[PDB]
A paper describes a structure:
The STAG1 protein is composed of HEAT repeats, a tandem repeat structural motif composed of two α helices linked by a short loop. STAG1 and STAG2, therefore, function redundantly in somatic mammalian cells to mediate sister chromatid cohesion, an event essential for cell viability during proliferation.
As expected based on the degree of sequence homology (73% identities over equivalent regions), the structure is highly similar to STAG2 (∼1.3 Å RMSD).
Numbering used by the authors: 85 to 257, 263 to 404
């Protein structure tokens, strides 16, 4: 509207486009989802365009295969790997768009059993593509999508604690307000369960396959993000089964990937309340971690020394 209302609100670049897409989704879900599908296609450098009759008739496997036939066979460059200057902030805007999209949808659209299933199915199929541009773009999107979903689960816990205290405060006084708080408590837990199913689909369908990708940057993206999930949501992500992925990646050939493993572990060991969960991991990968304090790469060795110092101070 007016200059004052626009300045007072101060919508970011990515929130302005997300709110426009959400309103487009309320008018026609298929057209908005088609625009979102073509977004991830065009972000990968693909020049193809999915049409609405393709979206309504074809499966993701056929759609992706048709989009695969629309790449420049000579060039392997795509927006996530171009130097600039039109691509300096694209990666930052790409990651921010995903977090803003899910944050603005977290109270209704995310639970409609159509939007998230379409996004995750698309990103899962693109993550298994032979085209590096498809794997890189979809995996980065899926990793940021998981982190956005963790933040949704974090906000749900806050709403669950508020509803619980409002229930017990009203209980210590059955009317309509009590049964309404009982129903919201049941509904919020169902939201948590549905968000966890989405996180499991991304983890089992994308992460466990992309963390050992042939491209080093794709491995670095997966390792960096699982460390974020382990710090934000340790009850579900910090376990011996998931720590095996970080432990096995300590032996990576590329220094950029080993560097991300160490910094991921640093954020876990720097929290004293997480040390009992890391005891078995420390004993299993002690020799590899201490051996990296003299890694052939200087930047890796510095962070391994920082990690060992945190391990020692924790005990």
């Amino acid at each position: 509207g007016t200059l004052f209302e626009v300045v007072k609100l101060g919508k970011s670049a990515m929130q302005s486009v997300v709110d426009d897409w959400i309103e487009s989704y309320k008018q026609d879900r298929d057209i908005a989802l088609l625009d979102l599908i073509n977004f991830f296609i065009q972000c990968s450098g693909c020049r193809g365009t999915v049409r609405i009759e393709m979206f309504r008739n074809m499966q993701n496997a056929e759609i992706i295969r048709k989009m695969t036939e629309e790449f420049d066979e000579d060039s392997g460059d795509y927006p996530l790997t171009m130097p600039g200057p039109q691509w300096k902030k694209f990666r930052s805007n790409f990651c921010e768009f995903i977090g803003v999209l899910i944050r603005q949808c977290q109270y209704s659209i995310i639970y409609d059993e159509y939007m998230m299933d379409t996004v995750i199915s698309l990103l899962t199929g693109l993550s298994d593509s032979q085209v590096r541009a498809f794997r890189h773009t979809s995996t980065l999107a899926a990793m940021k999508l998981m982190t956005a979903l963790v933040n949704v689960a974090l906000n749900l816990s806050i709403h669950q604690d508020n509803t619980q205290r409002q229930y017990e405060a009203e209980r210590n006084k059955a009317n309509e307000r009590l049964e309404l708080l009982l129903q919201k408590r049941k509904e919020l837990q169902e939201n948590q369960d549905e968000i966890e199913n989405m996180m499991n689909s991304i983890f089992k369908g994308i992460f466990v396959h992309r963390y050992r990708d042939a491209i080093a940057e794709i491995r670095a993206i997966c390792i960096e993000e699982i460390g974020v999930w382990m710090k934000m949501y340790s009850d579900a992500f910090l376990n011996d089964s998931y720590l095996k992925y970080v432990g096995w990646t300590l032996h990576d050939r590329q220094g950029e990937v080993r560097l991300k493993c160490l910094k991921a572990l640093q954020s876990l060991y720097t929290n004293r309340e997480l040390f009992p969960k890391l005891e078995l991991f420390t004993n299993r990968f002690k020799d590899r971690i201490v051996s990296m304090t003299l890694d052939k790469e200087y930047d890796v060795a510095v962070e391994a020394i920082r990690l060992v110092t945190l391990i020692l101070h924790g005990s």
